[PDB]
Design a binder for this molecule. Structure first.
Ligand SMILES: OC[C@H]1O[C@H](O)[C@H](O)[C@@H](O)[C@@H]1O
Ligand SMILES: OC[C@H]1O[C@H](O)[C@H](O)[C@@H](O)[C@@H]1O
Length: 686
């Protein structure tokens, strides 16, 4: 007694779904699993709707041209076959179910349209489209019509349109040019004008759909129809003496029918992926499985070599193969879908007489171009959005790792600087007398009277976006001793203090340099250069440097206290919002009042509005797919904070620190970063 495992399949209702049912049974007799196959209308439109919310079928059958869109939306699981299995099916059938180098369905059958004619009514079928009108009035004058076929789905009409120059995209040597779309060129117009003239001269009827045609030919009311393999069973059971042959030519050139590979995709949202594989690989794609479907509705030229070889001597299949060679295989790109919609209306309008042929096709080219554009953009968006996770999976570790001693210059460059990952180096500052000497008492006896440039801000956030402005801190020149007073509580000051950022010898502040080093020698030998700056850092515990990135190799050394960093690799850029801001600077008056004051004749300054501590996920939801790294640097410790790394600094009260700025190498890594940042803004990711 259960409510248990199942396998539901969607397949179009012109295909042998009863044959597929039987195969479903032999499954259900060899496991307990009930296999139910369904043929809903517009199943290929329903699937991408319903499968994203998690519902939908387990397996979907359709011509392969639909299967790329399904994969661009991530609805199709990757199929993983043995190679004893991949060499069981023809190679080009696998290539039709390959999106962005990856397999997304199992190929079932290769199908193309052919000219089905009534051998009793028409002993020698026409070789040209141009004969058909002549042939029609000769047959109306015997009580029937010459040619009938579905005029409601562009798939049937397209072999003629493409004959004299029509083409979707462009399949010149190598593969498809998605800039070169050709649905409103001379040759497209020619075939379509011909189709429309057939209707005009009442050789055909614009209202004719699939069902009207099939019924007509199978009753012997039409000498010729145009259909694919699935249609043959219903004529065999009718008793029209019929043949299947090469499509007639137009203006001396062959009809070019888009070739379709019936494919089975697996629903990425299925709880049954592995039974789906046991069903298709080992029950359907067999001589036994394809036979049971084919007995119902002929599949065409199958993908399974074994059973393809056993059937290929059917003149109906040979003819199918002939027309497929004269035609071109459909691309599976997600642009296929809007292409069909565009031509569907183009044909339906030109045949009904609503628009001329020359405008219907013009409209279809224009409107399909506009979608082909937005589709391109979305493909770019995903590339940029899947990139950040792709990167950190490969190089960027989720923690800042510690070294127990300084690395060799070689090892420092090969392990950290070139791969652009941070680390904390230990036991590298123990030769600094600063580590023992630098007390807020020794600093007061040593540089207490020395006047420095001090950063004043109302809320502790220097260089942050405040409303519509990027605001820089107020500057006040104070001795260090009264910086220390305000920090120990002994005195008071408007806002939040912290010492600004070139001291140790260019401020000046030279009495401390002897307590430190002018550079990190193993770092300098590694980067092949001296630091551009050496900065002394002292400040309030409310000073929060906001999220930004530097064009410098920064060695952050902590002498007393702690430093709390929140890092993001340059890779996380597509998910880090950037805006453009009017640059300002705080003015502090002798009232303790902070006023925002636009920086005159400065360029707009790009900055990150996002607050990584408490992010507005409503305004910036994309940021929740970034991956922050956290570390804490403390007394005696040195953080290597690579170039272009997004960082956000906090510290304990009265934290003292020295940091070296080496200029970065402007290299391939930099140039790529500019490219991404630019593509992030163009594609409106922000
Ligand atoms: O409506 C036209 C359709 O007819 C058949 O189902 C073909 O398999 C499919 O490729 C074609 O698109
Ligand atoms: O007529 C156009 C239709 O036929 C072709 C494809 O099989 C189908 O995906 C498409 O929509």
């Amino acid at each position: 007694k259960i409510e248990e495992g199942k396998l539901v399949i969607w397949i179009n209702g012109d295909k042998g779904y009863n044959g597929l049912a039987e195969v479903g049974k032999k499954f259900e007799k060899d496991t307990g699993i009930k296999v139910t196959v369904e043929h809903p209308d517009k199943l290929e439109e329903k699937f991408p709707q319903v499968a994203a919310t998690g519902d939908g079928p387990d397996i979907i059958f359709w011509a392969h041209d639909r299967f790329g869109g399904y994969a661009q939306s991530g609805l199709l699981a990757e199929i993983t076959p043995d190679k004893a299995f991949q060499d069981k099916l023809y190679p080009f059938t696998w290539d039709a179910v390959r999106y962005n180098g990856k397999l997304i369905a199992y190929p079932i059958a290769v199908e193309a349209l052919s000219l089905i004619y009534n051998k009793d009514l028409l002993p020698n079928p026409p070789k040209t489209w141009e004969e058909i009108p002549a042939l029609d009035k000769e047959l109306k004058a015997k009580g029937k019509s010459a040619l009938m076929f579905n005029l409601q789905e562009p798939y049937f009409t397209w072999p003629l349109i493409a004959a004299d120059g029509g083409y979707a995209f462009k399949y010149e040597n190598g593969k498809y040019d998605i800039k070169d779309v050709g649905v409103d060129n001379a040759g497209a117009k020619a075939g379509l004008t011909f189709l429309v003239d057939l209707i005009k001269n009442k050789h055909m009827n614009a209202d004719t759909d699939y069902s009207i045609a099939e019924a007509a030919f199978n009753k012997g009311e039409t000498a010729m129809t145009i259909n694919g393999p699935w249609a043959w069973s219903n004529i065999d059971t009718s008793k029209v003496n019929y043949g299947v042959t090469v499509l007639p030519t137009f203006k001396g050139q062959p009809s070019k029918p888009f070739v379709g590979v019936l494919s089975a995709g697996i629903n990425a949202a299925s709880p049954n992926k592995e039974l789906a594989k046991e069903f298709l690989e080992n029950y359907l794609l067999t001589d036994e499985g394809l036979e049971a479907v084919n007995k119902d509705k002929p599949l065409g030229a199958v993908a399974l070599k074994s059973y393809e070889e056993e059937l290929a001597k059917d003149p109906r299949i040979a003819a199918t193969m002939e027309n497929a060679q004269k035609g071109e295989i459909m691309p599976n790109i997600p642009q296929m879908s809007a292409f069909w919609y565009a031509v569907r209306t183009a044909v339906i309008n030109a045949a009904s007489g609503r628009q001329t042929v020359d405008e219907a096709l013009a409209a279809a080219q224009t409107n399909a171009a506009a979608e082909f554009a937005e589709a391109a953009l979305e493909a770019v968006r995903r590339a940029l959005q899947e990139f950040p996770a792709a990167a950190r999976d490969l190089n960027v570790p989720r923690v800042v790792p510690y070294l127990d001693e300084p690395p060799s210059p070689l090892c420092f460059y090969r392990d950290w600087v070139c791969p652009n990952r941070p680390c904390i180096i230990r036991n590298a500052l123990q030769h600094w007398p600063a580590l023992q000497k630098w007390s807020l008492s020794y600093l007061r006896a040593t540089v207490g009277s020395t006047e420095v440039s001090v950063a004043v801000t109302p809320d502790g956030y220097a260089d942050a976006v405040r409303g519509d402005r990027f605001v820089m801190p107020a500057e006040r020149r104070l001795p260090i001793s009264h910086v220390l007073d305000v920090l120990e509580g002994r005195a008071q000051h408007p806002g939040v203090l912290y010492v600004q950022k070139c001291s140790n010898l260019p401020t000046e502040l030279p009495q401390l340099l002897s307590d430190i080093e002018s550079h990190v020698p193993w770092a300098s030998e590694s980067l092949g250069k001296m630091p551009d700056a050496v900065n002394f850092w002292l400040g309030d515990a409310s000073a929060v440097t906001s999220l930004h990135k530097d064009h410098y190799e920064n060695l952050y050394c902590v002498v007393s206290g702690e430093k709390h960093f929140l890092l993001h690799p340059p890779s996380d850029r597509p998910f880090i919002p950037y805006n453009l801001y009017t640059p300002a600077t705080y003015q502090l008056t002798e009232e303790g009042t902070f006023r925002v004051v636009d920086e005159e004749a400065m360029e707009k300054v790009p900055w990150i509005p996002l607050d990584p501590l408490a992010p507005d996920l409503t305004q910036y939801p994309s940021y929740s797919q970034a991956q922050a790294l956290h570390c804490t640097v403390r007394a005696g410790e040195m953080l290597y904070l690579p170039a272009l790394w997004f960082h956000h600094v906090q510290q304990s009260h009265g934290c003292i620190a020295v940091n070296f700025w080496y200029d970065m190498e402007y290299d391939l890594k930099y140039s790529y970063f500019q490219l991404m940042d630019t593509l992030t803004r163009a594609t409106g990711l922000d």
